[PDB]
Structure 1
Amino acid sequence: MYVRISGRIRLNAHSLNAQGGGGTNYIEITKTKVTVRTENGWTVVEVPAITGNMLKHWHFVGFVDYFKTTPYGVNLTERALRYNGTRFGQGETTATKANGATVQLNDEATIIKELADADVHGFLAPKTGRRRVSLVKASFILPTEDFIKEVEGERLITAIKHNRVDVDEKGAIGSSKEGTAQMLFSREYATGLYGFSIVLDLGLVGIPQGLPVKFEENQPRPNIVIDPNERKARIESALKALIPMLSGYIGANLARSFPVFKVEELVAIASEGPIPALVHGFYEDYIEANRSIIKNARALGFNIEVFTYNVDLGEDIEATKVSSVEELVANLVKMV
């Protein structure tokens, strides 16, 4: 049961996914170069962005949060409870389960059976060679093209300075000789309307990627190493992980910035069989392309379901208007 989501969200006063600085008093927001058509010819512009890796990490965080409450929630890694995204670093051949049990890494079936994070978000153990591609595909968050057209850059960035006050028992700022830590650092904050796209190929949960089928009598059937209730719980948790992503829980510096994060518009499709990915929301002409893709794919015989928020998509396409992301995930979990 596959899902594709795309759309546009407006972010203000956000510093998500900065460059960290490391050992300096300046922290820069991550930059990436994008190609813009423009009426004067193709150009390249450096714009702030949020890497897809952190988007994937926050989806993993949401999935763990919603799977902990599930009665089958014991089937997680101890690292997952701490939101540690590392999957079986080099040199280790064992995994510590949430309950404390030890799981061998010599077989992929057991790993996906009693470790949900490795099942959904994939894993890799260099020591033994086992691997599994992730079931979640995340793309970069980029400011949309027509926004760059309309704003003409404006540098889209401010630098705000915060102090590091170290007042001792005597009430002095010090002179960096006694051991005080009174300094002045700075953080970069961006704004604008960004576009996002996310892909969930939730059709291999609990099914090893080595032997997806069994062929009992030359009749294909999914090879599930777990009971169907665990599959349903994992799929529901993965779908519900989108709620603490479109509310403003994406990115870093949440304690001091907490991006404003209004969702502007979105379109999503979901189907049991394989379907083409939707058009990313960065492009200005992405509603028409998505409309054409949906219409022609449904003409080809694909049984897809379309949910649209703040997008009309005309009349020919049979789509259900959705009020918010919560209603979208409710509809998604309605159809198992």
Structure 2
Amino acid sequence: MYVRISGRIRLNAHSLNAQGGGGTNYIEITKTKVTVRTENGWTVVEVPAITGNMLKHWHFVGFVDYFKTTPYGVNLTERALRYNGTRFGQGETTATKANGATVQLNDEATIIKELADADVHGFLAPKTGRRRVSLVKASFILPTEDFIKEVEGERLITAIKHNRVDVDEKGAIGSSKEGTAQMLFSREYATGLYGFSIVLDLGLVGIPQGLPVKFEENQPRPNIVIDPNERKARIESALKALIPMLSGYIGANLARSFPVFKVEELVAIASEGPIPALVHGFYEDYIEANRSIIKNARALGFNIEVFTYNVDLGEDIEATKVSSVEELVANLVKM
């Protein structure tokens, strides 16, 4: 419904956010800078960070994977199955579904009903406007400065060479004229302890933002312009899309790197209505600050349920001891 997950992740030796390889041979991994407070001053370090676009793309990938399980897989665009993510264009008005059905762009009511991918991440149509805000938002995957405080150095960038062997008509090796594909390139993999934070907005699934409520009987109720039974199924299709994140399906080079992924600690809040995000998995004061933010939301009248994984988070909060992401989802799918 309204779930905010965050925490710290320990993944190392992973090739994420490379520089392509159009002509550059040494494929150096992206390098970032972070500031950290020490000895009454601020210092920076050349440490890699992963953008959240990888996280959003993997959410899109997992959405269709968990959407094809239910018999409601008809309502899905063809481009979603090929991992396109273009969402129409400046002049594209018709839609390409799995069965080839045509969709007319007039309002979100006839779009979020016949199509499901266009609602989770939104779309745009400059010909007729009608822009849809992405319901799912990702965060940049960057290493915490606690790791820098305990390291403040070291290479932490594993540069390994990889070779692509090639054969001729009989097993010969060419240099520049025999028509060979022999190549010897480099790959840098990143290490360290990073942080993650994902927000989900399942309350707008099937409810247009322009008219969120019905408002014809003096009783504001959600304007579910789609069928409720399949709306509930769509809830889980996006809720389980974050399960592959907590398993290793992050970034690229999964066939050759497959990051060594295991979450050490996380905190989440689940609620029926809109709720603030707790903290990014970066700052050292990411526990007690959350201990504050909860009491900053309970006094406002929010029925927030806190789920904790490998964190005490004090004792007054009625948090639930979570041991993995899957039972968190299982405890969220009911509501």
Query: 8 Å contact 2:248–2:259 — kept in the other structure?
Result: yes
Offset of residue 77 of structure 1: 0.4
The Cα offsets for residues 269-308 of structure 1, whole Å up to 9 and x where unpaired, read as 0111121111111111101111111133223321100110
Query: Compared with structure 1, are the counterparts of its residues 124 and 32 closer, same or farther at alpha carbon in structure 2 (3 Å cutoff)?
Result: farther
Q: Counterparts of 1:235-254 in structure 2 under 5 Å?
A: 235-254=235-254
Deviations 1:165-186 (A, max 9, x none): 1111211111120210112111
Post-superposition offset of 1:40:
3.5
Check the 8 A contact 1:266/1:310 in 2, yes or no.
yes
Contact kept, 8 Å, 1:21 with 1:28, in 2: the verdict is no
Q: CA deviation at 1:44?
A: 3.4
Deviation at 1:237, TM superposition (A): 1.0
Moved more, 142-151 or 97-106: 97-106
Cross-structure match for 1:285: 285
CA shift digits 1:192-251 (9 cap, x unpaired)? 111010000111000111111221033212111111012111111111111111100011
Q: Distance in 2 between matches of 1:36 and 1:73?
A: 48
Q: Is the 8 A contact 2:246 2:263 kept in 1?
A: yes
Distance 2:123 2:40 in 1: 46
| CA deviation after TM superposition for structure 1 residue 99, in Å | 1.3
Are 1:179 and 2:151 counterparts? no
Partners of 2:102 and 2:43 in 1: CA distance: 54
Tell me if structure 1 keeps the 8 A contact 2:120–2:135. Answer: yes
**What is the CA-CA distance between 1:41 and the residue it aligns to?**
1.4
Contact 2:5 2:268 in 1 (8 A): yes
Q: Which runs of 5+ in 1 are unaligned?
A: none
Unpaired runs of 5+ in structure 2? Answer: none
Partners of 1:112 and 1:206 within 8 A in 2 = yes
Q: Which sits farther off after the overlay, 137-146 or 101-110?
A: 101-110
Q: Is the Cα–Cα contact under 8 Å of residues 45 and 152 in structure 2 kept in the other structure?
A: no
> 1:242, 1:329 within 8 Å by CA — same for their partners in 2?
no
**How far does residue 253 in structure 1 lie from its aligned partner after superposition?**
0.2
Q: What is the CA distance between 1:36 and its match in structure 2?
A: 2.1
Partner SS for 2:315:
coil
Of 27-36 and 118-127, deviating more is: 27-36
Distance 1:90 1:34, change over 3 A: farther
Query: Judging changes above 3 Å, is the alpha-carbon distance between structure 1 residues 126 and 34 closer, same or farther for their aligned structure 2 residues?
Result: farther
Measure the CA separation in 2 of the matches of 1:31 and 1:312: 34
| Alignment root-mean-square deviation, CA | 1.3
Structure 1: 4+ residue segments shifted above 6 A: none
CA–CA distance in 2 between the matches of 1:118 and 1:167? 46
Distance in 1 (CA, whole Å) between partners of 2:186 and 2:3 is: 40
Matched-pair identity in %? 100
Aligned length: 335
SS of residue in 1 equivalent to 2:45: strand
Secondary structure, aligned partner of 1:17: coil
String of CA shifts for 1:81-116, please: whole Å, max 9, x gaps. Answer: 112222113331211111111112232211111110
**How far is the alpha carbon of 1:65 from its aligned partner?**
0.6
Given that residues 50 and 141 in structure 2 are in contact (C-alpha distance below 8 angstroms), is that contact kept between their aligned partners in structure 1? yes
> Do the aligned partners of 2:30 and 2:49 also contact (CA within 8 Å) in 1?
yes
Q: Aligned partners of 1:254, 1:126: CA distance in 2, in Å?
A: 35
How far did residue 14 of structure 1 move?
0.5
Greater shift in the superposed pair: 247-256 or 211-220: 211-220
Q: Answer whether contact 1:62 1:245 (CA < 8 A) is retained.
A: no
